[PDB]
Ligand SMILES: CC(C)=CCC/C(C)=C/CC/C(C)=C/COP(=O)(O)C(Cl)(Cl)P(=O)(O)O
């Protein structure tokens with residue numbers, strides 16, 4: 415049981431303590447949960463139940479029932495159950511916006527002072543109201559000034575009252591929210607955390623809790639078999655024995671679980687995790703290991719998709735390059751075989767673009783150039799690797815793939831570009847880079863520059879949120895990938911890192927949840 419050991423990882427998937435009795439039980443519990451979501455309940459209680467389903471990682475199992483139940487509730491006119499109740503108003507606002515039902519920010523106007531625009535100080539001791547308002551605020555869009563105020567107000571109040579909470583469970587939840595709001599958290603990681611918290615909630619539904627545990631374990635058995643296959647692949651490539659990129663495979667896979675955790679997306683997940691392992695490896699090639707001439711050759715080979723001069727590179731750079739080449743061809747081929755469309759031109763292209771972006775960073779370094787923040791981000795949203803990961807994910811999942819469709823996603827329209835910019839700046843804040851560039855450009859202090867970059871995180875999120883209520887040429891699951899890579903970034907770049915990481919990996923991928 416060591417997350418970093420490939421003997422152990424390569425064995426993962428041989429045995430599973432998940433039975434076909436477990437699977438039958440799960441089928442029966444799923445049917446009762448489905449009935450609870452669709453069945454009668456008071457509306458607030460129903461919202462709280464649907465929120466709990468989502469938090470336990472189960473929205474993927476019940477999305478239709480959840481949307482149907484919220485639609486019913488949204489079409490009420492009977493509104494006495496929420497109007498003037500901040501907790502109810504805020505929960506409704508969030509779950510409706512999350513599920514594509516618009517609610518205006520002015521539902522919160524009655525809790526403001528009509529003069530100052532400040533929220534009323536009488537809210538300062540409604541903990542659950544403040545919490546729900548804080549969580550809701552992250553569903554806001556650009557220009558929704560009441561929600562911006564709601565963030566700053568609820569953040570300051572929750573910080574003030576955290577230590578005054580009596581309920582240990584509510585206190586843990588508030589602490590958790592102030593670290594990251596729910597909207598920014600990675601689904602699968604939050605699910606493992608929330609199962610334990612939910613078990614201790616007073617309103618806890620034991621049927622739902624039991625289903626959540628069992629489903630978690632069943633899903634986890636697919637992940638273990640994936641990890642097995644990926645670790646055997648990775649050891650097959652020899653790249654585990656490289657100087658650099660210690661733990662790159664399992665780091666990549668843990669990030670991939672943030673992007674997409676569902677069992678039916680297992681083959682796509684494995685291919686994203688391969689690409690990710692290669693991104694982090696090759697990034698080290700370009701950042702730490704290769705000479706400028708070696709990197710120029712690596713980039714030119716990739717740009718031409720032509721490995722004739724590959725032997726000019728030393729072994730430790732030639733191996734990563736050929737593995738990138740072979741895996742890119744494998745993934746494009748999968749698209750041909752499974753989806754009807756040869757994806758090799760698109761995997762080659764995004765790798766070429768990414769190495770070009772690495773090459774530009776290496777040239778800035780070598781020549782002592784200080785880019786502006788905009789100049790840096792234009793390149794760095796590519797170098798972070800998410801255009802590569804996201805275009806690949808689209809290739810593998812879009813229905814009826816065409817050159818026209820792949821060309822559009824590969825051109826990085828705003829929705830996609832927002833995601834890539836976020837992943838880059840979140841990574842940079844988690845510590846050349848965003849903050850220092852903005853410092854160089856404006857003379858700001860570190861503190862002020864960091865606040866600026868944090869503001870950019872909030873702004874790009876608002877743009878993501880809004881892009882989600884508008885019609886898109888994109889569908890599920892790509893729509894979810896695009897959000898969930900950002901949540902993955904937040905989760906792994908909060909500011910011992912080793913033991914926190916290992917604990918997440920062990921608790922989410924390695925140890926099952928004990929069932930009585
Ligand atoms: C969703 C998915 C499968 C992610 C795979 C892992 C990937 C490639 C994460 C990109 C973010 C990572 C792990 C960056 C760490 O690398 P760094 O060298 O610090 C850099 Cl931030 Cl890339 P940079 O080289 O710009 O300094």
Ligand SMILES: [Mg+2]
Pocket residue numbers: 697698701
């Ligand atoms: Mg690097």
Ligand SMILES: [Mg+2]
Pocket residue numbers: 697698700701772775797
């Ligand atoms: Mg780099």
